[PDB]
């Protein structure tokens, strides 16, 4: 269920931003100066709600690597 929810909401969140950004003209473009914003787009909708609700884990381990 968690995997299905993450998949659906990631697709939803990317599509909604892309369409809204293409409806004012100024459609997204494949360039190094425009692609990074997907980091915020993804970090916003699914991930920052999963962390708050506690489904997604965070912190540091011992494996000696961050979660």
């Amino acid at each position: 269920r968690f995997s299905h929810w993450v998949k659906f909401r990631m697709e939803e969140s990317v599509f909604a931003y892309m369409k809204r950004r293409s409806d004012m003209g100024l459609s997204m473009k494949m360039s190094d100066e425009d692609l990074p914003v997907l980091k915020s787009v993804l970090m916003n909708n699914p991930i920052n709600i999963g962390i708050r609700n506690g489904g997604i884990l965070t912190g540091y381990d011992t494996n000696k690597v961050s979660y």
Partner: protein, 56 residues
């Protein structure tokens, strides 16, 4: 801008030279009139309602 135009001695007719008279000095201006009437299109509504966002 107001302009002033003056003739040269070569352009002055000999008769005008004899009579000691200077002609065809010209000036030009523009007048800055005032306001008299005003009209308005007020509108009263119970609420409010294309997104191009592209520089014309």
């Amino acid at each position: 801008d107001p302009t002033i135009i003056i003739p040269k001695r070569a352009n002055i007719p000999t008769n005008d030279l004899a009579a000691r008279i200077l002609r065809d000095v010209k000036v030009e201006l523009v007048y800055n009139n005032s306001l008299h009437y005003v009209k308005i299109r007020a509108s009263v509504v119970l609420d409010r309602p294309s997104t191009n966002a592209q520089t014309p």
